[PDB]
Design a protein around this nucleic acid. Structure first.
Ligand SMILES: [Mg+2]
Ligand SMILES: [Mg+2]
Ligand SMILES: [Mg+2]
Ligand SMILES: [Mg+2]
Ligand SMILES: [Mg+2]
Ligand SMILES: [Mg+2]
Ligand SMILES: [Mg+2]
Ligand SMILES: [Mg+2]
Ligand SMILES: [Mg+2]
Ligand SMILES: [Mg+2]
Ligand SMILES: [Mg+2]
Ligand SMILES: [Mg+2]
Ligand SMILES: [Mg+2]
Ligand SMILES: [Mg+2]
Ligand SMILES: [Mg+2]
Ligand SMILES: [Mg+2]
Ligand SMILES: [Mg+2]
Ligand SMILES: [Mg+2]
Ligand SMILES: [Mg+2]
Ligand SMILES: [Mg+2]
Ligand SMILES: [Mg+2]
Ligand SMILES: [Mg+2]
Ligand SMILES: [Mg+2]
Ligand SMILES: [Mg+2]
Ligand SMILES: [Mg+2]
Ligand SMILES: [Mg+2]
Ligand SMILES: [Mg+2]
Ligand SMILES: [Mg+2]
Ligand SMILES: [Mg+2]
Ligand SMILES: [Mg+2]
Ligand SMILES: [Mg+2]
Ligand SMILES: [Mg+2]
Ligand SMILES: [Mg+2]
Ligand SMILES: [Mg+2]
Ligand SMILES: [Mg+2]
Ligand SMILES: [Mg+2]
Ligand SMILES: [Mg+2]
Ligand SMILES: [Mg+2]
Ligand SMILES: [Mg+2]
Ligand SMILES: [Mg+2]
Ligand SMILES: [Mg+2]
Ligand SMILES: [Mg+2]
Ligand SMILES: [Mg+2]
Ligand SMILES: [Mg+2]
Ligand SMILES: [Mg+2]
Ligand SMILES: [Mg+2]
Ligand SMILES: [Mg+2]
Ligand SMILES: [Mg+2]
Ligand SMILES: [Mg+2]
Ligand SMILES: [Mg+2]
Ligand SMILES: [Mg+2]
Ligand SMILES: [Mg+2]
Ligand SMILES: [Mg+2]
Ligand SMILES: [Mg+2]
Ligand SMILES: [Mg+2]
Ligand SMILES: [Mg+2]
Ligand SMILES: [Mg+2]
Ligand SMILES: [Mg+2]
Ligand SMILES: [Mg+2]
Ligand SMILES: [Mg+2]
Ligand SMILES: [Mg+2]
Ligand SMILES: [Mg+2]
Ligand SMILES: [Mg+2]
Ligand SMILES: [Mg+2]
Ligand SMILES: [Mg+2]
Ligand SMILES: [Mg+2]
Ligand SMILES: [Mg+2]
Ligand SMILES: [Mg+2]
Ligand SMILES: [Mg+2]
Ligand SMILES: [Mg+2]
Ligand SMILES: [Mg+2]
Ligand SMILES: [Mg+2]
Ligand SMILES: [Mg+2]
Ligand SMILES: [Mg+2]
Ligand SMILES: [Mg+2]
Ligand SMILES: [Mg+2]
Ligand SMILES: [Mg+2]
Ligand SMILES: [Mg+2]
Ligand SMILES: [Mg+2]
Ligand SMILES: [Mg+2]
Ligand SMILES: [Mg+2]
Ligand SMILES: [Mg+2]
Ligand SMILES: [Mg+2]
Ligand SMILES: [Mg+2]
Ligand SMILES: [Mg+2]
Ligand SMILES: [Mg+2]
Ligand SMILES: [Mg+2]
Ligand SMILES: [Mg+2]
Ligand SMILES: [Mg+2]
Ligand SMILES: [Mg+2]
Ligand SMILES: [Mg+2]
Ligand SMILES: [Mg+2]
Ligand SMILES: [Mg+2]
Ligand SMILES: [Mg+2]
Ligand SMILES: [Mg+2]
Ligand SMILES: [Mg+2]
Ligand SMILES: [Mg+2]
Ligand SMILES: [Mg+2]
Ligand SMILES: [Mg+2]
Ligand SMILES: [Mg+2]
Ligand SMILES: [Mg+2]
Ligand SMILES: [Mg+2]
Ligand SMILES: [Mg+2]
Ligand SMILES: [Mg+2]
Ligand SMILES: [Mg+2]
Ligand SMILES: [Mg+2]
Ligand SMILES: [Mg+2]
Ligand SMILES: [Mg+2]
Ligand SMILES: [Mg+2]
Ligand SMILES: [Mg+2]
Ligand SMILES: [Mg+2]
Ligand SMILES: [Mg+2]
Ligand SMILES: [Mg+2]
Ligand SMILES: [Mg+2]
Ligand SMILES: [Mg+2]
Lengths: 44, 274
RNA sequence: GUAGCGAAAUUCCUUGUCGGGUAAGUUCCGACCUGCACGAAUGGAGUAACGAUUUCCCUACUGUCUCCACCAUGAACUCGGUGAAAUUGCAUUACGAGUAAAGAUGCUCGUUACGCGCAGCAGGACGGAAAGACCCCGGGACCUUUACUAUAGUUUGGUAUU
RNA sequence: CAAGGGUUCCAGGGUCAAGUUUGUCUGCCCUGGGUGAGUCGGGUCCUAAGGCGAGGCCGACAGGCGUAGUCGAUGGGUAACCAGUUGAUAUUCUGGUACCGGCUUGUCACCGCAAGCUGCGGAGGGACGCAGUGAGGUAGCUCAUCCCCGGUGAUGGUUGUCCGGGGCUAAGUGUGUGGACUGUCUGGUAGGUAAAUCCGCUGGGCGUGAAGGUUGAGGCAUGAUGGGGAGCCCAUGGUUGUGGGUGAGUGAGUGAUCCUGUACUGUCGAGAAAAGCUUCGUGAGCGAGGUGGCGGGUCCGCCCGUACCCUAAACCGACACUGGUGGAUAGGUAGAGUAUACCGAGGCGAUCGAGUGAAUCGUGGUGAAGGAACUCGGCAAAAUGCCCCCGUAACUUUGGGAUAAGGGGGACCUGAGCUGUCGUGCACCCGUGCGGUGUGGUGGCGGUGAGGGGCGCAGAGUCCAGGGGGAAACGACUGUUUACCAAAAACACAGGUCCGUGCGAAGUCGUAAGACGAUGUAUACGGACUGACUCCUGCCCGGUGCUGGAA
RNA sequence: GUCCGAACCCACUUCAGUUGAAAAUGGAGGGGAUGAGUUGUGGAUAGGGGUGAAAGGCCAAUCAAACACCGUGAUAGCUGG
RNA sequence: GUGGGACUGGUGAUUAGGACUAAGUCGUAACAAGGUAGCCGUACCGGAAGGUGCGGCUGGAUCA
């Protein structure tokens, strides 16, 4: 059937992209937390 | 007028439609249109603040001159009478005798070719716009300004009518279509005559679809909701509200006008009653 | 408690009573009113048309049935290849009448039974799957209100702005 | 093709793993290779929804909103086609022939408070719904005694039209047939943010009763002496390609979902924006007496994508999963059809098999007599089914009910006449040299056919394809709903009533500013209940609520 | 918001499946099919909140208050060890 | 034979009014100004006669 994940690169980049995260202070703190943890992927 | 539909199909059975006899032109003036995207009843916060709004046929806004006093003394010919989807009245397209074209609410009785004018020395004819000090007492006007220079705000819908009853001092007393008696500044402008298309209220839409493309979404009455959704919600089987009638937000029925504002200019309340 | 309607999606008694339909009708349709406990915009009574709605009947039609038979196929079955699953205290795991935590393969007294497989059927192992939802007790959640205590909001007056 | 995937694509080597079996094979592994654009799809251009937002306003802080702006396609704008080639790429490379923008150059013509260029805006334009019919075309398709290239048949016949195949070419340019568009010459001018000679609004003169002009469905010409297109050659090389051998390009029928066409007609629910573009000036600067125009020549033309899968074994579903996935093309015969049956272009034989008349389960098939006796219940199945013609009840809101019900005919052979269209041809208007027009043609093709006839159990012979009637309850109706046990009598609904709201509306979101309501104004808006329509809607204000009043 | 009927959308009945081909489907029928239709792309509304032709429905395969992390080794007169 | 209509008779639980009969019950509506003049059409109301509104009539009258 139609499943939950329907990919769209533009929507993904607008939602979880680096600039989207940098727009708000919550996203900036998320990037900081991922940097502290050591993720190689800071954002989508 | 109104044209009654024949009962060929259900939903067309009791319905009716205006015959559009007064329209002289089936297209609008291109230079007086702006885009009017739909809101769906949503706020600038993106939430529904006015319910029951959405969908409907696409519409283009017609720029209506509700001031009329920046063309004082310039006669205009009523070039056309045409349809405005944004209102229950018709719109008269006016060709001023200087090249400027404009739109007004079409007064009842005016048609293609008649000459309208604005100003204190304007003649008292339907469609002419004058200050209230110059409009004679006992006259039926429309498109009345609350504050001088603010533009038309009262008596604008189809068939609307305002009665000028007195001009004592620096205030003119007007009976609004609600029947309320109100005082306004004599310098406030008004257009002679009443609004046309007065018979549109008798239109039977006869069809859920016609309001659906008029832009009205279905209305779910609160008594068939759940208690979390509406104070009238709940109950086993069909019930009443289980309480006195209230709004979906728990506000009891009652007068809601702010008792302390411009009440010093209201002579008597509308007196709907029964 | 009016018009209207009434054993009704409402009638407990109840398969009320009478009438129609059937060879036979607790359902049905028309009546009666004795309305346990109808009723007029939480609308009353009707209503052509509409309905994958509910109910009754007639006709046509048939394997629905009397009453099943036969045919072909995908599994099943045999051979070669590949190869799981839930479950699992144990094992060389009968029946009868008993007995016992009151329903026994396992205890008593008897009876029967050579060892091991294959295809099958589901009576039992209180079979498997889900720390019963029903019930109660403890906790929680959400909902309600003329429960308590508060509060946003709305409103009153004072005072500052004055 | 898009989305998504990301090297799966190609060649060679490999068979541990993966593949529901095997495997020499692979979408697997290993190595190397493969994607070429001024025109295609995006960016360099434009805006929609929406996002962000200099200042700004609002908010203890954090922040909210928003102006000027600036982004943002799913839309607007925008110049190229055919053929050929590779193991893998092709509106990209190559061939042929075009187009667009620059730079530069040759030549001709022209300007000069007064060139031009660039900014800046004005106006025009871009620019818009839904539904329907018809007309003129073309694509396509069919047929052919016509033109080509073959064939003469394993078994009776098969050298005449008997059989098979083919009967082709683009963008661009020119032409201007249908069709469409369009009076002309001057004057004035409260408007178009600064202006306008470009617009708008108005005054006159003349004016066919259309005549020119402008335009451009197709056709023709050109592009094209080219390209493409079968079987004959010493030969090739023997699952091969080379050089010659390419032959034809006819006519009719039928006919679009395409073109004219945003046409035309109908219609209420009244159907984006902005830029490019044309023109107008000048609220800006540049700029010399140098530019700007029309034909001709040279060079310059950027970035990203381009392989491959893609109604799927490569995407979304943990799988190489009977599921889901937007768009384009979509031939023949029977048919109303994009249904269905069998076929075409093309692609597949499906990723464990071999057997064997067990019971049994699934999936189909048939059935004597009976025909709902089954069962909670006609559940399932059967019957009915198509077209044409005849005919059709209670009731009704006059529309319906209705395909009511209930009947007849259908295919095959032959076939008189009637028609669609074309036709060499007759005469004729000819504006002929018109790409024409009306009479008019033995005929070809197609459609339709009264009548007559044949055969069978059966002629809508297969697939496909309503059972019908009577009555009651509920809801008027079409719709909507518990994704994953309830589709209903529930919700909605059109209609109705009451209450609120005089506009900074009430109401709602928010701390606020603001916003929706609404660029609406009481014939409106918000809330409540009721729920088409018909006839109606009684009595009670004590209680509670609401409204008003204030001793 | 006509009728019959494909695509398309739906999900009424039945059978099968129910360690499925499939964490909701398949076969046979069935409803809508010019409309309150359906669908693509992008966008908006966010957790006591959204949205809801209203079923407490839906909000990333279990919603009478999502998910993740944190307070946190919550607490449990209860069950187990 | 089959099918769908047309017309019509009997019958029908139940129900409606009509006629007649107790010398039944309930009121007194009309006939006199019948004790509210009567009646006509219509409307609503009421156990029942009737009551009332609107318009009309004299087949009523007071007072002239
Ligand atoms: Mg998801
Ligand atoms: Mg314009
Ligand atoms: Mg925001
Ligand atoms: Mg509403
Ligand atoms: Mg509107
Ligand atoms: Mg409910
Ligand atoms: Mg509540
Ligand atoms: Mg309630
Ligand atoms: Mg109840
Ligand atoms: Mg009974
Ligand atoms: Mg009972
Ligand atoms: Mg009986
Ligand atoms: Mg009442
Ligand atoms: Mg009530
Ligand atoms: Mg009730
Ligand atoms: Mg009702
Ligand atoms: Mg009813
Ligand atoms: Mg009915
Ligand atoms: Mg239904
Ligand atoms: Mg029978
Ligand atoms: Mg088998
Ligand atoms: Mg085996
Ligand atoms: Mg015992
Ligand atoms: Mg025993
Ligand atoms: Mg024993
Ligand atoms: Mg022992
Ligand atoms: Mg065994
Ligand atoms: Mg077995
Ligand atoms: Mg057993
Ligand atoms: Mg058990
Ligand atoms: Mg359970
Ligand atoms: Mg337990
Ligand atoms: Mg549980
Ligand atoms: Mg508690
Ligand atoms: Mg919970
Ligand atoms: Mg105060
Ligand atoms: Mg004060
Ligand atoms: Mg790629
Ligand atoms: Mg590789
Ligand atoms: Mg790979
Ligand atoms: Mg490969
Ligand atoms: Mg293997
Ligand atoms: Mg290999
Ligand atoms: Mg290989
Ligand atoms: Mg730019
Ligand atoms: Mg914007
Ligand atoms: Mg700032
Ligand atoms: Mg820009
Ligand atoms: Mg952009
Ligand atoms: Mg390729
Ligand atoms: Mg090519
Ligand atoms: Mg080339
Ligand atoms: Mg412009
Ligand atoms: Mg427009
Ligand atoms: Mg022979
Ligand atoms: Mg041929
Ligand atoms: Mg001017
Ligand atoms: Mg100016
Ligand atoms: Mg045609
Ligand atoms: Mg490529
Ligand atoms: Mg490719
Ligand atoms: Mg494909
Ligand atoms: Mg698949
Ligand atoms: Mg996968
Ligand atoms: Mg055909
Ligand atoms: Mg097919
Ligand atoms: Mg083929
Ligand atoms: Mg394929
Ligand atoms: Mg496989
Ligand atoms: Mg066997
Ligand atoms: Mg059968
Ligand atoms: Mg037989
Ligand atoms: Mg039989
Ligand atoms: Mg028989
Ligand atoms: Mg029979
Ligand atoms: Mg029976
Ligand atoms: Mg029985
Ligand atoms: Mg059935
Ligand atoms: Mg059948
Ligand atoms: Mg009919
Ligand atoms: Mg029939
Ligand atoms: Mg014949
Ligand atoms: Mg027949
Ligand atoms: Mg057929
Ligand atoms: Mg009834
Ligand atoms: Mg009943
Ligand atoms: Mg319904
Ligand atoms: Mg209804
Ligand atoms: Mg329906
Ligand atoms: Mg829906
Ligand atoms: Mg469900
Ligand atoms: Mg309404
Ligand atoms: Mg307000
Ligand atoms: Mg606003
Ligand atoms: Mg209701
Ligand atoms: Mg009282
Ligand atoms: Mg009361
Ligand atoms: Mg009070
Ligand atoms: Mg329809
Ligand atoms: Mg689809
Ligand atoms: Mg269901
Ligand atoms: Mg089952
Ligand atoms: Mg229908
Ligand atoms: Mg988004
Ligand atoms: Mg509930
Ligand atoms: Mg979910
Ligand atoms: Mg909670
Ligand atoms: Mg909620
Ligand atoms: Mg703590
Ligand atoms: Mg603990
Ligand atoms: Mg325990
Ligand atoms: Mg009788
Ligand atoms: Mg009396
Ligand atoms: Mg009397
Ligand atoms: Mg009375």
């Amino acid at each position: 059937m139609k499943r939950t994940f329907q990919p769209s690169n533009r929507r993904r980049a607008r939602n979880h992209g680096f600039r989207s995260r940098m727009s708000t202070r919550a996203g900036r703190s998320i990037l900081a937390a991922r940097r502290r943890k050591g993720r190689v992927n800071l954002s989508a | 007028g109104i044209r009654k539909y024949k009962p060929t199909t259900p939903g067309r059975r009791g319905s009716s439609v205006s015959d559009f006899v007064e329209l002289t032109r089936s297209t609008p003036e291109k230079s007086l249109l702006v885009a009017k995207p739909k809101t769906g009843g949503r706020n600038n916060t993106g939430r529904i603040t006015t319910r029951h709004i959405g969908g409907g046929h696409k519409q283009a806004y017609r720029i209506i001159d509700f001031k009329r006093y920046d063309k004082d003394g310039v006669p205009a010919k009523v070039a056309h009478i045409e349809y405005d989807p944004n209102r229950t009245a018709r719109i008269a397209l006016l060709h001023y005798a200087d090249g400027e074209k404009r739109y007004i609410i079409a007064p009842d009785g005016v048609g293609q070719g008649t000459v309208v004018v604005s100003g204190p020395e304007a003649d008292i004819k339907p469609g002419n716009n004058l200050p209230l000090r110059n409009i004679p007492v006992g006259t039926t006007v429309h498109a009345v300004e609350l504050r001088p220079g603010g533009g038309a705000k009262m008596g604008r819908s189809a068939g609307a009518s305002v009665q000028l009853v007195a001009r004592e001092g620096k205030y003119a007393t007007v009976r609004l279509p609600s029947g309320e008696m109100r005082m306004v500044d004599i310098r406030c402008r008004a257009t002679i005559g009443e609004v046309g298309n007065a018979e549109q209220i008798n239109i039977n839409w006869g069809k859920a679809g016609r309001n659906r493309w008029k832009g009205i979404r279905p209305t779910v009455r609160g008594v068939v909701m759940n208690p979390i959704d509406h104070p009238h919600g709940g109950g086993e089987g069909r019930t009443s509200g289980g309480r006195h009638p209230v709004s979906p937000w728990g506000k009891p029925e009652g007068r809601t006008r702010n008792k302390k504002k411009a009440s010093s200019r209201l002579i008597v309340r509308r007196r709907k009653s029964g």
